[PDB]
Amino acid sequence: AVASGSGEPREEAGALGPAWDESQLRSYSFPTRPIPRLSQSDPRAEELIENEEPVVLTDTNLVYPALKWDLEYLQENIGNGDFSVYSASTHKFLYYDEKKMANFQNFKPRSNREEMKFHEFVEKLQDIQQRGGEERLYLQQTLNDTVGRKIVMDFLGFNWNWINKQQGKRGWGQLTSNLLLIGMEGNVTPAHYEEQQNFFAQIKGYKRCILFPPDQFECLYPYPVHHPCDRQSQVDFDNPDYERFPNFQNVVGYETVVGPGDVLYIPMYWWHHIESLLNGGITITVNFWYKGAPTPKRIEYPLKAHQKVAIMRNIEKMLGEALGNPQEVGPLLNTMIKGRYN
Amino acid sequence: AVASGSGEPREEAGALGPAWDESQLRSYSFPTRPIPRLSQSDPRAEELIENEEPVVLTDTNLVYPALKWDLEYLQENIGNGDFSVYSASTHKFLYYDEKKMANFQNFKPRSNREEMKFHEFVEKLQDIQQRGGEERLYLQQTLNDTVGRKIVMDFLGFNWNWINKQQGKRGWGQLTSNLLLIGMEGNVTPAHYEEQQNFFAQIKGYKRCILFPPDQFECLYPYPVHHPCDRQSQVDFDNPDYERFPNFQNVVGYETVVGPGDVLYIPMYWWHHIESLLNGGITITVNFWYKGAPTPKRIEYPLKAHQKVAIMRNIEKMLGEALGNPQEVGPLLNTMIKGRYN
Amino acid sequence: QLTSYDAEVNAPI
Amino acid sequence: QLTSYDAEVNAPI
Ligand SMILES: O=C(O)CCC(=O)C(=O)O
Ligand SMILES: O=C(O)CCC(=O)C(=O)O
Ligand SMILES: [Zn+2]
Ligand SMILES: [Zn+2]
């Protein structure tokens, strides 16, 4: 009733049937309520972004020229740069930071990155489907100046007017990157948060986005900051370990399904889990990552959740540096608390 | 055998019998080994201080002129300043910081401070013994310029030559204070550590000093830094709570009994428990508190125990400040660790 | 400065 | 600076 989740699937224009159905959504242990789906012109929408709460905007025209993109058009135009393509034999593409792996010798990534040309990505993808294989690929590459000219012309056709006014109104920093994500149906990016703001622009296919506010930190159990999986949840949403992660029993999400033309504001520090709909075919998304506003030169109380998260990260970072080794951070913290604060 | 504790009591000169006996010592749950008792001229002694390990020095003449002090001589000469005198109905004089009590409304000190003149202290003391009362007093007052002239002349007669060379050789900072401690037999100062160096000069009576190295932090469970009892152990040595304080089962001490003329080096950050011998009469001690050496402008690994303690204190202090309230420090630390580092 | 933050995202810097 | 220390003792500053 109020945990209505994604709502009843919207009907595509010209009576082309429901855009997707409930059977295409994985099933999880926690409840969810809908993210509001609004017009760009709607004051409530503006109110939501202003308060750093998520909103799906349905008519921004942010990536209007990308709406025609598909593998053929992109193979033809995207140029000959290298693309990072992740490979796995599980649906879950857990993000990991390769620069942090030296310190965590026992971290064994379930997904592998292969650099390859776009045409190779399409071939590899084609091979899989034809031999009916089980491996999965997820291409995740920042857009850069090696892309061909039509892609340049597409990008330039994005609604910069609208998004630059957002960046200005919110006091955000610079646009840092636009990630192009191309995924196979049923792919999942497990829950994590970002230390930038994100307008997440869906282009092809459908993605279910499950978000949790920064105040659910205690229910989602991020990896240690020096771990490769910093910012990512330790919890396996498909098999939650309630003994290690008791407060995942209290977690409550905000969810939506985005399709072509939709843009989801994912506010900085908000947890998000992203899945490409089962049997939905391939998905394409391009994101827009902005540095957040500078923090006030002085802090007002009561502190917000995301400011406590920032504090916790800085304590872990400083401890890692002062102790000279990140693996001592935990023993020190435990000594700090046991019998004194727990 | 090697947990010989304080050793066999030394025999006073001129066959005046053992200075004290084992029945005068409270009994505790942990074992102890002896602190070395050495001559000032002994290279080992110098080696111990250099390494910041405790040593009882038997012949420094640090407070030679104070050796004649007793209540009469001091009532007569100590002047008319106010003396802080603590009062309690238990043997344990737990130190607390009055400036921190505002933040811990529920802290109820078992001992009370009364300012009073020395003659009043001696009267109050006299009254107690005569009416055979159970209350206890402990006078603890820094020596300052209000003291009378003979006390000034006594102080000036201290062995500054010897102790100034110590301060120099070790690279210590300034002498900050000389606390005069006058206690009733059976008084205990429960275990704590100091963030200064200490030469502890015994003048009258006997004190058993039990020390623990900085690396026993995990066994001794200091109060939170913003608590009034910062630097003091939470553990009741007379009734240890092994459920709250499991690692107090692993604690191992270094002990000695100091009498007139002895000086105990209590190195900075070393825990110490101090008791005036049962049925020993009153005790007098004067301490000498020096700021420690500046820390290296750069840190060498592996870090020492006392440097981890300094780190832990600075993390608690910074958290208290950033969160705007010391009582949030624990909830934040717990959120930091649960399911992530424990 | 304990509330300061950097800009890490699920993509290489 | 995390290894810096002040000078607190069992007596009023
Ligand atoms: O769509 C995905 O699989 C992940 C996208 C994401 O986490 C992001 O853009 O921040
Ligand atoms: O002798 C006492 O009761 C306490 C002395 C003490 O803790 C010190 O001098 O640091
Ligand atoms: Zn993300
Ligand atoms: Zn002390």
Side-chain angles (χ1 to χ4, degrees):
Chain A
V2 200
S4 3
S6 276
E8 282 273 282
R10 302 155 300 258
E11 292 280 7
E12 330 175 31
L16 298 170
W20 45 276
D21 80 277
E22 215 215 342
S23 74
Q24 303 180 267
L25 298 189
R26 297 167 180 278
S27 60
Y28 292 117
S29 69
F30 49 79
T32 63
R33 201 157 69 77
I35 293 161
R37 165 186 185 87
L38 301 172
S39 167
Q40 170 279 318
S41 54
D42 190 335
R44 297 164 291 154
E46 207 81 342
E47 206 196 328
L48 291 166
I49 294 164
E50 181 53 2
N51 286 103
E52 282 170 277
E53 291 177 61
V55 57
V56 169
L57 302 153
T58 61
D59 56 348
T60 63
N61 290 295
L62 185 52
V63 296
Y64 166 78
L67 301 184
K68 51 178 209 273
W69 293 4
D70 60 7
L71 299 179
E72 199 207 326
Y73 180 85
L74 296 167
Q75 183 162 326
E76 187 68 40
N77 292 285
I78 204 171
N80 230 231
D82 284 343
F83 289 79
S84 308
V85 177
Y86 291 86
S87 194
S89 58
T90 189
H91 55 286
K92 289 180 290 259
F93 286 82
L94 193 58
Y95 185 79
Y96 56 96
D97 180 348
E98 288 168 34
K99 303 176 290 158
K100 285 169 174 177
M101 290 178 71
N103 295 321
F104 288 73
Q105 233 62 47
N106 289 353
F107 176 62
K108 282 305 143 55
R110 299 229 62 217
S111 78
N112 314 285
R113 180 175 56 86
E114 182 167 2
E115 303 296 298
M116 78 186 55
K117 310 298 172 185
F118 195 89
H119 83 89
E120 305 178 295
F121 163 64
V122 191
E123 269 135 47
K124 196 163 169 91
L125 191 55
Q126 281 173 3
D127 162 70
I128 276 157
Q129 88 214 342
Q130 292 171 29
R131 75 191 163 76
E134 223 52 67
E135 92 170 291
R136 285 159 181 290
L137 309 173
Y138 211 128
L139 174 154
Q140 315 184 351
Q141 176 55 53
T142 35
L143 291 176
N144 56 50
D145 60 22
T146 87
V147 302
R149 266 164 204 187
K150 291 196 150 146
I151 297 314
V152 159
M153 294 289 282
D154 287 347
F155 182 83
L156 279 173
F158 287 180
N159 190 354
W160 298 110
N161 179 50
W162 173 79
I163 200 175
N164 301 340
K165 282 184 306 200
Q166 288 300 317
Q167 170 188 31
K169 275 139 160 173
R170 302 318 142 198
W172 297 348
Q174 75 188 140
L175 181 68
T176 68
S177 37
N178 288 107
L179 201 65
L180 168 64
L181 295 128
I182 304 180
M184 290 174 49
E185 57 188 358
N187 278 12
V188 172
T189 291
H192 59 281
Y193 67 98
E194 250 91 37
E195 283 185 311
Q196 290 191 51
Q197 313 274 12
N198 179 357
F199 288 115
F200 184 92
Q202 191 59 14
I203 280 155
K204 182 184 181 62
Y206 293 84
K207 276 174 177 186
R208 184 210 192 171
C209 301
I210 303 159
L211 270 59
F212 317 81
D215 82 359
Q216 311 259 286
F217 184 99
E218 293 219 284
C219 315
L220 285 165
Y221 299 99
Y223 289 87
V225 154
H226 294 96
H227 195 275
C229 297
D230 180 35
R231 289 178 303 98
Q232 328 298 294
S233 180
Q234 283 170 103
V235 180
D236 183 344
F237 271 37
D238 299 324
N239 189 24
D241 195 334
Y242 295 131
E243 292 190 39
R244 300 171 69 203
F245 317 119
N247 283 121
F248 191 74
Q249 286 164 122
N250 308 110
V251 85
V252 187
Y254 284 81
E255 84 169 272
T256 198
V257 181
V258 284
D262 297 334
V263 172
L264 175 63
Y265 175 47
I266 303 178
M268 186 166 52
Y269 292 105
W270 282 58
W271 296 86
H272 47 283
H273 162 109
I274 309 288
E275 61 189 41
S276 286
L277 257 56
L278 308 160
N279 298 297
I282 75 163
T283 54
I284 302 185
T285 310
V286 174
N287 83 6
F288 288 65
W289 269 318
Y290 295 81
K291 285 211 200 324
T295 59
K297 264 221 198 83
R298 290 206 317 180
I299 303 301
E300 316 181 338
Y301 299 91
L303 278 190
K304 289 155 59 192
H306 76 83
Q307 303 173 293
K308 295 170 171 167
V309 178
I311 286 158
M312 289 190 288
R313 305 181 53 78
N314 285 322
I315 298 306
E316 296 171 61
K317 286 186 199 187
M318 289 172 65
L319 291 178
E321 234 199 299
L323 295 167
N325 152 45
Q327 300 203 157
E328 281 188 67
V329 166
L332 196 131
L333 287 168
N334 277 294
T335 298
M336 271 195 92
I337 85 165
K338 277 148 78 150
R340 296 186 67 235
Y341 294 98
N342 66 356
Chain B
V2 200
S4 3
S6 276
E8 282 273 282
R10 302 155 300 258
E11 292 280 7
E12 330 175 31
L16 298 170
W20 45 276
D21 80 277
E22 215 215 342
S23 74
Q24 303 180 267
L25 298 189
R26 297 167 180 278
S27 60
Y28 292 117
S29 69
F30 49 79
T32 63
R33 201 157 69 77
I35 293 161
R37 165 186 185 87
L38 301 172
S39 167
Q40 170 279 318
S41 54
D42 190 335
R44 297 164 291 154
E46 207 81 342
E47 206 196 328
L48 291 166
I49 294 164
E50 181 53 2
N51 286 103
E52 282 170 277
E53 291 177 61
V55 57
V56 169
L57 302 153
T58 61
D59 56 348
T60 63
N61 290 295
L62 185 52
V63 296
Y64 166 78
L67 301 184
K68 51 178 209 273
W69 293 4
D70 60 7
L71 299 179
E72 199 207 326
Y73 180 85
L74 296 167
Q75 183 162 326
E76 187 68 40
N77 292 285
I78 204 171
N80 230 231
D82 284 343
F83 289 79
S84 308
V85 177
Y86 291 86
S87 194
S89 58
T90 189
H91 55 286
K92 289 180 290 259
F93 286 82
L94 193 58
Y95 185 79
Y96 56 96
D97 180 348
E98 288 168 34
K99 303 176 290 158
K100 285 169 174 177
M101 290 178 71
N103 295 321
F104 288 73
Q105 233 62 47
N106 289 353
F107 176 62
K108 282 305 143 55
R110 299 229 62 217
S111 78
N112 314 285
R113 180 175 56 86
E114 182 167 2
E115 303 296 298
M116 78 186 55
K117 310 298 172 185
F118 195 89
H119 83 89
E120 305 178 295
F121 163 64
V122 191
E123 269 135 47
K124 196 163 169 91
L125 191 55
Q126 281 173 3
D127 162 70
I128 276 157
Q129 88 214 342
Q130 292 171 29
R131 75 191 163 76
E134 223 52 67
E135 92 170 291
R136 285 159 181 290
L137 309 173
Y138 211 128
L139 174 154
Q140 315 184 351
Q141 176 55 53
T142 35
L143 291 176
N144 56 50
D145 60 22
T146 87
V147 302
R149 266 164 204 187
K150 291 196 150 146
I151 297 314
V152 159
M153 294 289 282
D154 287 347
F155 182 83
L156 279 173
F158 287 180
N159 190 354
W160 298 110
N161 179 50
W162 173 79
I163 200 175
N164 301 340
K165 282 184 306 200
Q166 288 300 317
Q167 170 188 31
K169 275 139 160 173
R170 302 318 142 198
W172 297 348
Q174 75 188 140
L175 181 68
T176 68
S177 37
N178 288 107
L179 201 65
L180 168 64
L181 295 128
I182 304 180
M184 290 174 49
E185 57 188 358
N187 278 12
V188 172
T189 291
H192 59 281
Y193 67 98
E194 250 91 37
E195 283 185 311
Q196 290 191 51
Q197 313 274 12
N198 179 357
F199 288 115
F200 184 92
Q202 191 59 14
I203 280 155
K204 182 184 181 62
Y206 293 84
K207 276 174 177 186
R208 184 210 192 171
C209 301
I210 303 159
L211 270 59
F212 317 81
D215 82 359
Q216 311 259 286
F217 184 99
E218 293 219 284
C219 315
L220 285 165
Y221 299 99
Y223 289 87
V225 154
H226 294 96
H227 195 275
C229 297
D230 180 35
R231 289 178 303 98
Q232 328 298 294
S233 180
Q234 283 170 103
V235 180
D236 183 344
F237 271 37
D238 299 324
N239 189 24
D241 195 334
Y242 295 131
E243 292 190 39
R244 300 171 69 203
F245 317 119
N247 283 121
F248 191 74
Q249 286 164 122
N250 308 110
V251 85
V252 187
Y254 284 81
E255 84 169 272
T256 198
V257 181
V258 284
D262 297 334
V263 172
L264 175 63
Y265 175 47
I266 303 178
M268 186 166 52
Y269 292 105
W270 282 58
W271 296 86
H272 47 283
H273 162 109
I274 309 288
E275 61 189 41
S276 286
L277 257 56
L278 308 160
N279 298 297
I282 75 163
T283 54
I284 302 185
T285 310
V286 174
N287 83 6
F288 288 65
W289 269 318
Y290 295 81
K291 285 211 200 324
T295 59
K297 264 221 198 83
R298 290 206 317 180
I299 303 301
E300 316 181 338
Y301 299 91
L303 278 190
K304 289 155 59 192
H306 76 83
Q307 303 173 293
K308 295 170 171 167
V309 178
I311 286 158
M312 289 190 288
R313 305 181 53 78
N314 285 322
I315 298 306
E316 296 171 61
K317 286 186 199 187
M318 289 172 65
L319 291 178
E321 234 199 299
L323 295 167
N325 152 45
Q327 300 203 157
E328 281 188 67
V329 166
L332 196 131
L333 287 168
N334 277 294
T335 298
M336 271 195 92
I337 85 165
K338 277 148 78 150
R340 296 186 67 235
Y341 294 98
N342 66 356
Chain C
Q1 252 161 17
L2 233 46
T3 39
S4 67
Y5 63 102
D6 292 323
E8 311 219 59
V9 300
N10 283 16
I13 66 150
Chain D
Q1 252 161 17
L2 233 46
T3 39
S4 67
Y5 63 102
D6 292 323
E8 311 219 59
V9 300
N10 283 16
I13 66 150

